[PDB]
Amino acid sequence: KIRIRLKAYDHEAIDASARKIVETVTRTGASVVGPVPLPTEKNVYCVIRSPHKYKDSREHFEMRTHKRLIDILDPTPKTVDALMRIDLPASVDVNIQ
Amino acid sequence: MPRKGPAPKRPLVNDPVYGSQLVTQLVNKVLLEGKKSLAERIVYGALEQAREKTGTDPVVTLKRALDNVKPALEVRSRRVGGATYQVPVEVRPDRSTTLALRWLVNFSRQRREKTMVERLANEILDASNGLGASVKRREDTHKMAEANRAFAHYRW
Amino acid sequence: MGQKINPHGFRLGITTEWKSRWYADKQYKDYVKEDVAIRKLLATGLERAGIADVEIERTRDRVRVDIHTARPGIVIGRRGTEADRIRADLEKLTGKQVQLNILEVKNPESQAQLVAQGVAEQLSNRVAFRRAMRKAIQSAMRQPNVKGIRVQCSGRLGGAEMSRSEFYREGRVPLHTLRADIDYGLYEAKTTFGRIGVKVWIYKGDIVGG
Amino acid sequence: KKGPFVDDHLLKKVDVQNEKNTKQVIKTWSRRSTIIPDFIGHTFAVHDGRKHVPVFVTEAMVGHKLGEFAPTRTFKGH
Amino acid sequence: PIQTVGRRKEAVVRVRLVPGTGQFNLDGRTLENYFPNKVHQQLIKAPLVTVDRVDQFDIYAHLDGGGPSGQAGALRLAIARALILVQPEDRPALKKAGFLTRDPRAIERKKYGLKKARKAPQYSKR
Amino acid sequence: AKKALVHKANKKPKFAVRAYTRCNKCGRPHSVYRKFGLCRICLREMAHAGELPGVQKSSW
RNA sequence: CUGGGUUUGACAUGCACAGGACGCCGGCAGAGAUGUCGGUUCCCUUGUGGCCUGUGUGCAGGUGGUGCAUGGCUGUCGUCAGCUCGUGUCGUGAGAUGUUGGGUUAAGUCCCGCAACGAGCGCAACCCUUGUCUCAUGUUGCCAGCACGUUAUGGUGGGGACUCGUGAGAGACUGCCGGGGUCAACUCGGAGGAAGGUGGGGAUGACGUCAAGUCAUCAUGCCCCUUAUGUCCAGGGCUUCACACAUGCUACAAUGGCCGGUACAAAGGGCUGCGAUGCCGUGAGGUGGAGCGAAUCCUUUCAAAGCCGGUCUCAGUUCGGAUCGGGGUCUGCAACUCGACCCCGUGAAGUCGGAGUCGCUAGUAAUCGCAGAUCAGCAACGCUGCGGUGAAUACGUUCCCG
Ligand SMILES: [Mg+2]
Ligand SMILES: [Mg+2]
Ligand SMILES: [Mg+2]
Ligand SMILES: [Mg+2]
Ligand SMILES: [Mg+2]
């Protein structure tokens, strides 16, 4: 079994690339599992001071990074050139594990 | 919202101990950031010290002192004809009710003593008797206004 | 000129798609180093053929290129002498093979860059700039699939050293709506007395492309 | 905390110098430090940007860099 | 098993109500230990204080997001939502004061061009 | 964007500090990023054109 | 710029007359350039495809100048509600109607009557994130009921039922009712409800204004030079001192400070990097490295305002840290004219700052927070993105500005 977890930046590339990649295994012919996405990698980090006299608009790390985890079955040589051929969104940091 | 008339008004809660509409706005005002328990406890403890000192209801004395600490003018800065005058403006009900409490809160910290209970209690006694620090500080705001009245007809 | 940015880059992330794209881990710099060189070479050589848009993807380090010309027959006169010339030049420049596939667009009158090149050539053709713009608009708006066109020629027109900027529009050309899918083309021409620029916008229709 | 900058450019030179055990001026743009005792016994050429001032060396001299003796300017009062 | 959710602008808490003396089994501590400001302790009980039921029912809440009062209001709305799964008789008594209606006021949008939330640098009238 | 620097940067010298970023598009060494690979303006161009992700220049 | 190279070049190329050595690996003169050196001494084959040394040749290189020749773009009038085109009519005309006029709205979205009938540009319109629900739904992550647990880790079986997870859909359309509305728009209130009347402000900066920053993002004809203004490096400095000034830290203290102890979450990035238990220190740090293309590990199970305890008792002080001598740490071949940091000591203006000026009606301005890339290294406390607690006020556009 080979797992694939593609990420995204602008809240849409995640599915725009999932519905295109996870369907290539079906186009080639094989079974696949449903969607199971992970929220994000957040990793609090806060050490810096500020002017301390005009110090307002309290905000911290507005950002979203979704993950789409789905497995693949029946791995063949023709099933590896599905994503490497083109990466249209430029934000999907896909990793085949 | 701003400069387009008064926005939708927000209600105000009342306390069932004394039953007054001027003993909760002050609480909400003194509820500074992070300080809501100690100040409220001190105010509650001083509300009875004042009742014992003045021998009158904790709210009637304050209602009467609101008029004793009621000013008539407020010094401003209005520039016209190459000169900046201290042209004041007439007092209004709500404006005065707010300014009196603002001055009371600002002068309750004038005394650099440590005892906050005393700082908050002994001031109301003198204010009701006619010698409060707020009553004394309210004199200059009217003196300067009367002095600058020579050019206070522009209604601004 | 105000903030009349190219609208083609506003919906490419919602409705339309990107022209060139690839993936590079610590190699984007070296990849663009050759991409810009290929872009300069094509702008120098193939511009005479009427290139519209060069999509430059990247296979496993060898080649992935696609071009959409407008005059099929001039760039390929005799197989080997003209079609393979650019391939050999690119192979000599960059040490990688090139499986160039020259395909033709559905029509030239529907592309923004092609009509831009046409107007730039008509301007240097010494013909009246106004009549040239009118003819270009009429040719491009012969309802192939389009619904609006907007051309703006600026520079030292009229064979003088002045600075004029005409304006013309047809149909609907909304720029504040995402459901437009407007195509834009940029280019600059050089005459015997100065430089000239042309801003073109072609609105086809309200295709949501969900 | 006696491990400051090693000044390899001068370390190699003083090494090849003590390999022959001579006392000559090391012509190099070394104005960084002379921390290691291997620099003792030999003379170097200070490069402060303008000129150089020779000085004698010995063993009881430990504690500064090679250029902080006299600044790029001169103190004379008038 | 009744289990609801209560969330604020940035907070969210899973709540479950049960019959028992007043106690909030938080993630390792209690209400008096998690809300010592003495104001959040009243804000959270605001819906259960309109019709006194604190000493009659127990709460089990797992909270996250937001700060102290953020989680306080999240658990408040959580209690407001959970009170309907047992007896809707108090639904009007709660809606009259205002509950189960999260304040639509939250963080707005900002980005380059400006530096703070709907705030521009001072410009002197010269 | 000096033709000497644009070559010295991509050159392969025998030192570490002798290497720079020196964006290849034009040669502006200021604000040239790693993942983007372009200077401030060279990146903002394609950003407003929507060529790359993470671009929202809102609030005036 | 102080001085020294190359001065057909440091970086590309079309032709001549000549080559297998250029290219590279080490020392040396060295301030380095650069030159002299050692090694390699071409990959094809007779014709040269690739290489460059110099020799002649046109050329590279201009960061040499003008946003008053241009292409192309922050910030502003302004998110202000207006700006134009086809036909028709009218006057010999610049030209008028449309677009004057009534209402609600931010609005020219609507209509009404009128020589007007239509449309474009903004608005309107669509939608991201947010505000609530349903379908799809289990990993590296949560845990109800079962077990394992013992305290740094649901770490480990099982439940998608719980929200976080996010593709689609319902859901806020003046949609309905009551009063006002030519009985036309529209408005106040009532309802489910998470949001109700352009929920929230946003990408959207419209015909144009100021020849508005920028010939230093880049291209560009004319003007000027090329044994040089091209280019290399050792060093100087754009941070020098008492200043006129500015988005404007540290502070001026009881709504403050000190130390020992002390809970939550919102929540970016990691392949030549974040970097833990524990040993080394009072501290910047050092030998080392589990984990790591990561809901794990790492900024630690992950701060403080506030929070329960001890205290100073209203002062140039135990708040305040600048500067200074000295241990130095840090990344850097290089911390000296010149970066950041802890600590031993000396311990300055300043006691909430006059005339004036400036931000701010809903999670807005303050009171505790954040930094990645821009760097190998730090001015980074100003920026591009950005969490939390949480009040004050509102007679109206007479008044200053647009
Ligand atoms: Mg100028
Ligand atoms: Mg006529
Ligand atoms: Mg130099
Ligand atoms: Mg400068
Ligand atoms: Mg560097």
UniProtKB/Swiss-Prot annotation, chain A:
GO function terms (MF aspect): structural constituent of ribosome; tRNA binding
UniProt name for this protein: Small ribosomal subunit protein uS10
Protein function: Involved in the binding of tRNA to the ribosomes.
UniProt KW tRNA processing keyword: no
Organism: Mycolicibacterium smegmatis (strain ATCC 700084 / mc(2)155) (Mycobacterium smegmatis)
Coiled-coil boundaries: none
Lineage: Bacteria, Bacillati, Actinomycetota, Actinomycetes, Mycobacteriales
Keywords: Ribonucleoprotein, Ribosomal protein
Subunit structure: Part of the 30S ribosomal subunit.
A cellular component annotation (GO) from this entry: ribosome
Family in the record: Belongs to the universal ribosomal protein uS10 family.
Superkingdom to which the source organism belongs: Bacteria
InterPro entries: Ribosomal_uS10, Ribosomal_uS10_CS, Ribosomal_uS10_dom, Ribosomal_uS10_dom_sf
Example GO BP: translation
From Swiss-Prot, chain C:
MF annotations from Gene Ontology: mRNA binding; rRNA binding; structural constituent of ribosome
Domain KH type-2: 38-106
The keyword Ribonucleoprotein is annotated on this UniProt entry: yes
Keywords: Ribonucleoprotein, Ribosomal protein, RNA-binding, rRNA-binding
Signal peptide: none
Gene Ontology cellular-component annotations: cytosolic small ribosomal subunit
GO biological process, alphabetically ordered: translation
Family from the record: Belongs to the universal ribosomal protein uS3 family.
Assembly and interaction partners: Part of the 30S ribosomal subunit. Forms a tight complex with proteins S10 and S14.
Other remarks in the entry: Binds 2-aminothiazole antibiotics, which are antitubercular agents.
Function: Binds the lower part of the 30S subunit head. Binds mRNA in the 70S ribosome, positioning it for translation.
Protein name from the UniProt record: Small ribosomal subunit protein uS3
Gene: rpsC
Curated annotation (Swiss-Prot), chain D:
Membrane-spanning ranges: none
Keyword DNA damage applies: no
Record-level GO cellular component terms: cytoplasm; small ribosomal subunit
Keywords per UniProt: Ribonucleoprotein, Ribosomal protein, RNA-binding, rRNA-binding
Sample GO molecular function, one term: rRNA binding
Keyword hit for Metal-binding: no
Protein role: Protein S19 forms a complex with S13 that binds strongly to the 16S ribosomal RNA.
Protein name listed in UniProt: Small ribosomal subunit protein uS19
Species whose genome carries this gene: Mycolicibacterium smegmatis (strain ATCC 700084 / mc(2)155)
High-level lineage: Bacteria, Bacillati, Actinomycetota, Actinomycetes, Mycobacteriales
Residues of the full protein shown: 6 to 83 of 93
Curated annotation (Swiss-Prot), chain E:
Cellular-component GO terms for this entry: cytoplasm; small ribosomal subunit
Sequence similarity: Belongs to the universal ribosomal protein uS9 family.
Protein name: Small ribosomal subunit protein uS9
Higher taxonomy: Bacteria, Bacillati, Actinomycetota, Actinomycetes, Mycobacteriales
Gene Ontology biological process: translation
Domain of life of the native organism: Bacteria
Keywords for this protein: Ribonucleoprotein, Ribosomal protein
Coiled coil: none
GO molecular function: RNA binding; structural constituent of ribosome
Gene: rpsI
